[PDB]
Design an enzyme around this catalytic site. Structure first.
Site, PDB file in Angstrom:
ATOM      1  CB  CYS A   1       0.371  11.309  -3.945  1.00 11.71           C
ATOM      2  SG  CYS A   1       0.110  11.351  -2.157  1.00 11.71           S
TER       3      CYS A   1
ATOM      4  CE  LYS B   1      -3.283   2.953   0.493  1.00 19.58           C
ATOM      5  NZ  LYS B   1      -4.266   3.341  -0.559  1.00 19.58           N
TER       6      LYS B   1
HETATM    7  C1  FMN Z   1      -9.101   0.671  -3.088  1.00 15.96           C
HETATM    8  C2  FMN Z   1      -7.983   1.164  -3.954  1.00 15.96           C
HETATM    9  C3  FMN Z   1      -6.831   1.713  -3.400  1.00 15.96           C
HETATM   10  C4  FMN Z   1      -5.776   2.152  -4.149  1.00 15.96           C
HETATM   11  N1  FMN Z   1      -4.668   2.680  -3.536  1.00 15.96           N
HETATM   12  C5  FMN Z   1      -3.614   3.025  -4.268  1.00 15.96           C
HETATM   13  C6  FMN Z   1      -2.348   3.351  -3.643  1.00 15.96           C
HETATM   14  O1  FMN Z   1      -2.272   3.326  -2.367  1.00 15.96           O
HETATM   15  N2  FMN Z   1      -1.372   3.690  -4.440  1.00 15.96           N
HETATM   16  C7  FMN Z   1      -1.462   3.652  -5.792  1.00 15.96           C
HETATM   17  O2  FMN Z   1      -0.467   3.848  -6.497  1.00 15.96           O
HETATM   18  N3  FMN Z   1      -2.622   3.368  -6.440  1.00 15.96           N
HETATM   19  C8  FMN Z   1      -3.663   2.972  -5.711  1.00 15.96           C
HETATM   20  N4  FMN Z   1      -4.842   2.652  -6.324  1.00 15.96           N
HETATM   21  C9  FMN Z   1      -4.902   2.566  -7.782  1.00 15.96           C
HETATM   22  C10 FMN Z   1      -4.608   1.185  -8.315  1.00 15.96           C
HETATM   23  O3  FMN Z   1      -3.243   0.830  -7.999  1.00 15.96           O
HETATM   24  C11 FMN Z   1      -4.776   1.149  -9.816  1.00 15.96           C
HETATM   25  O4  FMN Z   1      -3.802   2.090 -10.372  1.00 15.96           O
HETATM   26  C12 FMN Z   1      -6.171   1.512 -10.301  1.00 15.96           C
HETATM   27  O5  FMN Z   1      -7.179   0.923  -9.446  1.00 15.96           O
HETATM   28  C13 FMN Z   1      -6.464   1.049 -11.752  1.00 15.96           C
HETATM   29  O6  FMN Z   1      -6.254  -0.327 -11.896  1.00 15.96           O
HETATM   30  P1  FMN Z   1      -7.614  -1.271 -11.991  1.00 15.96           P
HETATM   31  O7  FMN Z   1      -8.336  -0.844 -13.231  1.00 15.96           O
HETATM   32  O8  FMN Z   1      -7.066  -2.655 -12.013  1.00 15.96           O
HETATM   33  O9  FMN Z   1      -8.332  -1.045 -10.684  1.00 15.96           O
HETATM   34  C14 FMN Z   1      -5.901   2.137  -5.576  1.00 15.96           C
HETATM   35  C15 FMN Z   1      -7.034   1.619  -6.130  1.00 15.96           C
HETATM   36  C16 FMN Z   1      -8.112   1.186  -5.366  1.00 15.96           C
HETATM   37  C17 FMN Z   1      -9.289   0.622  -6.092  1.00 15.96           C
HETATM   38  C1  W7I Z   2      -5.554   9.312  -6.563  1.00 11.41           C
HETATM   39  O1  W7I Z   2      -4.658   9.121  -5.355  1.00 11.41           O
HETATM   40  C2  W7I Z   2      -5.069   9.713  -4.151  1.00 11.41           C
HETATM   41  C3  W7I Z   2      -6.289  10.476  -3.939  1.00 11.41           C
HETATM   42  C4  W7I Z   2      -6.572  11.014  -2.643  1.00 11.41           C
HETATM   43  C5  W7I Z   2      -7.777  11.777  -2.411  1.00 11.41           C
HETATM   44  C6  W7I Z   2      -7.979  12.356  -1.142  1.00 11.41           C
HETATM   45  C7  W7I Z   2      -7.004  12.176  -0.136  1.00 11.41           C
HETATM   46  C8  W7I Z   2      -5.823  11.436  -0.375  1.00 11.41           C
HETATM   47  C9  W7I Z   2      -5.623  10.854  -1.638  1.00 11.41           C
HETATM   48  C10 W7I Z   2      -4.395  10.135  -1.858  1.00 11.41           C
HETATM   49  C11 W7I Z   2      -4.123   9.530  -3.103  1.00 11.41           C
HETATM   50  C12 W7I Z   2      -2.944   8.726  -3.259  1.00 11.41           C
HETATM   51  C13 W7I Z   2      -3.206   7.206  -2.892  1.00 11.41           C
HETATM   52  C14 W7I Z   2      -4.215   6.633  -3.845  1.00 11.41           C
HETATM   53  C15 W7I Z   2      -5.523   6.357  -3.481  1.00 11.41           C
HETATM   54  C16 W7I Z   2      -6.094   6.566  -2.150  1.00 11.41           C
HETATM   55  O2  W7I Z   2      -5.511   6.054  -1.150  1.00 11.41           O
HETATM   56  O3  W7I Z   2      -7.196   7.164  -2.110  1.00 11.41           O
HETATM   57  N1  W7I Z   2      -6.461   5.831  -4.411  1.00 11.41           N
HETATM   58  C17 W7I Z   2      -6.073   5.639  -5.721  1.00 11.41           C
HETATM   59  O4  W7I Z   2      -6.892   5.298  -6.593  1.00 11.41           O
HETATM   60  N2  W7I Z   2      -4.812   5.935  -6.060  1.00 11.41           N
HETATM   61  C18 W7I Z   2      -3.850   6.381  -5.154  1.00 11.41           C
HETATM   62  O5  W7I Z   2      -2.758   6.558  -5.610  1.00 11.41           O
END
Ligand code: FMN
Ligand code: W7I
Ligand code: FMN
Ligand code: W7I
Lengths: 313, 313
Positions: free
Chosen positions: B131, B44
């Site tokens: 981010c 994560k």
């Molecule tokens: C619940 C959730 C949490 C995620 N948290 C992160 C994260 O912490 N860091 C990150 O680089 N992307 C995060 N993402 C984005 C995913 O890594 C991915 O880039 C995005 O969901 C698109 O891929 P998908 O079509 O397979 O879901 C998150 C996505 C979801 C759905």
């Molecule tokens: C798109 O990435 C984020 C969006 C946020 C929105 C409000 C507050 C914090 C946020 C932090 C991130 C970075 C972590 C992340 C998140 C997340 O932890 O919400 N979700 C993603 O789809 N991609 C991510 O890279």
């Protein structure tokens, strides 16, 4: 129960219309859209000179939507101005004319000549900002200084209420900046959200090939892919532009999708991909579907729920 | 016949891994991903201090994909580093650690501490550039001067090969500018395309309500909605960054989807929404499906077709 709207000093039987570029390039197309149950139509985005557009194949559709790199094929401004001034029957429904000049100067030249027709016949201008400018620079609405230039020059040249067609945005700071630019221009009375989601890439697994010829297969996406993106932009601009109308465009295949648009803030609801695929019969189906959802919910008019999307706590 | 490959001086049983954020927050999650058939796992995205994240509900999924505004809930960097340094079994598969500090200084402070564990244990850094950001400023990867600064500072502080998680872009001039920034940094050895498509809006018709609580229902989209966006970004960076690897992420539910990512240029293939929905059993199905498509086509290796998407004329 009714779908009627009154806005921009026009009356509309219902909120549905084509999205610019679909079923609106030729006189035949425009007559077809006029004969349909849509509440309005918009003409194909035009340039000063006719264009043949990009090589084919340049549109493809699939279960979840479409991809296009049409290249602005159009019959040229003089054709669309003639349609507006001499051929369109305004007793049937209102007409929007979309323009998409390749430079600010080209847009100015067209709007200058549109204006007396707009004043006399009531054709409505939709200026397409989701459009190329200098190659190697982002499209106009992604370059906020260019966007402001274009709106200043067009406001001066046209002098009448108009609206703008926007690309989708993905970043809150962009919503903030973009709306604040639009809110500099009082003649901008409606904002159409959204144009296609830019430079997607569809690949066919069997052939191992992209499915459109231009731009190495990269093109704008429409359809079911883009509905949440469209909703977000409709609502973002609805919230930030309280003195303007928002028209919704993106992902409409059913009355329910239209209901969601309207909940987000849409006044007019435009139909691209699904219209391209299904044909103009779609409009009776969308009207019926929307009326059925309204009946189930007790809603008698669109204003009862327009912009009334609820948030959580 | 097997899907094993070598990249970044590591060996991988297959190209599949979780996407950051999915099934990777706690020790339990990480042990689950380690026990799965995936070729690798990524933790994560973490901050220096632990975070609770946003109010629930903050994730929802639907037949076409997911929307999230998790808010970077994580156990904090010291936990992930401890996992990397003491708990992960490197004999099982490689580990990537995702860092997402809220400033450049926070990232530099984390990467200085990761460096020795990377040297000793071989953990790989994925720096999240996606981010999210303050009013009046766009996210880092959409502000190319900030991106350049982050990468300058991290490269100096870390001094070892690393990768970057990119948001999607939608404009060819942005692909050209972003790739040129990345190419300034020789320690950036992989680019993961894409993070979620930002700030979409899902609305439930029955309830007339958004479906997530934070941000008035606005959040990042994943899943089927984004596959053509993800393929376009994979291919755009594959074409522009010939001395880097590209990792694909977005819209992978099947071996066929993985095949299209690899055709576009992907070396590793990350699975987010589909994994959240299906659980870690998905990895055996994806492997089987990908090997079935290879077999039908006569392909014996991934390198035979990686990046070999065909264009028309
Ligand atoms: C619940 C959730 C949490 C995620 N948290 C992160 C994260 O912490 N860091 C990150 O680089 N992307 C995060 N993402 C984005 C995913 O890594 C991915 O880039 C995005 O969901 C698109 O891929 P998908 O079509 O397979 O879901 C998150 C996505 C979801 C759905
Ligand atoms: C798109 O990435 C984020 C969006 C946020 C929105 C409000 C507050 C914090 C946020 C932090 C991130 C970075 C972590 C992340 C998140 C997340 O932890 O919400 N979700 C993603 O789809 N991609 C991510 O890279
Ligand atoms: C074949 C095709 C041609 C289009 N041409 C234009 C155009 O000339 N001007 C414009 O503003 N948008 C144009 N668009 C974008 C549509 O107006 C619409 O914004 C986009 O397709 C999203 O709506 P949808 O999801 O209903 O397709 C075109 C779209 C398609 C599919
Ligand atoms: C950004 O939309 C366009 C893309 C183009 C790409 C190559 C050449 C010309 C282009 C013109 C435009 C503007 C017209 C347009 C088109 C189009 O005619 O290709 N397609 C859309 O999905 N939306 C549009 O607004």
């Amino acid at each position: 129960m009714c779908l009627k709207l009154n806005l921009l000093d026009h009356v509309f039987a219902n909120p549905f219309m084509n999205a610019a570029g679909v079923l609106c390039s030729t006189e035949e197309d425009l007559r077809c859209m006029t004969a349909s149950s849509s509440g309005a139509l918009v003409s194909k985005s035009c340039t000063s000179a006719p264009r043949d557009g990009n090589p084919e194949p340049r549109y493809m559709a699939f279960p979840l939507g479409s991809i296009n790199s049409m290249g602005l094929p159009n019959l040229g401004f003089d054709f669309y101005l003639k349609y507006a001034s001499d051929l369109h029957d305004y007793s049937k429904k209102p007409l929007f004319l979309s323009i998409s000049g390749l430079s600010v100067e080209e847009n100015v030249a067209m709007v200058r000549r549109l204006a007396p027709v707009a004043q006399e016949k009531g054709v409505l201008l939709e200026l397409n900002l989701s459009c190329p400018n200098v190659p190697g620079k982002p499209q106009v609405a992604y370059d906020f200084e260019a966007m402001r230039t274009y709106l200043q020059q067009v406001s001066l040249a046209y002098g009448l209420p108009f609206g703008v067609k926007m690309p989708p945005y993905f970043d809150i700071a962009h919503f903030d900046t973009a709306a604040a630019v639009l809110n500099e221009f009082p003649l901008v009375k409606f904002v159409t959200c959204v144009n296609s989601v830019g430079n997607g890439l569809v690949i066919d697994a069997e052939s191992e090939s992209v499915v459109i010829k231009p731009k190495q297969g990269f093109g704008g996406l429409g359809g079911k892919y883009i509905l949440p993106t469209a909703l977000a932009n409709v609502n973002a601009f609805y919230r930030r532009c309280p003195d303007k109308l928002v028209f919704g465009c993106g992902g409409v295949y059913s009355g329910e999708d239209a209901f969601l648009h309207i909940l987000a803030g849409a006044s007019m609801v435009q139909v691209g991909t699904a219209l391209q695929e299904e044909g103009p019969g779609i409009f009776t189906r969308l009207e019926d579907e929307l009326l059925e959802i309204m009946a189930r919910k007790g809603y008698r008019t669109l204003e009862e729920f327009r912009g009334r999307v609820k948030t959580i706590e």
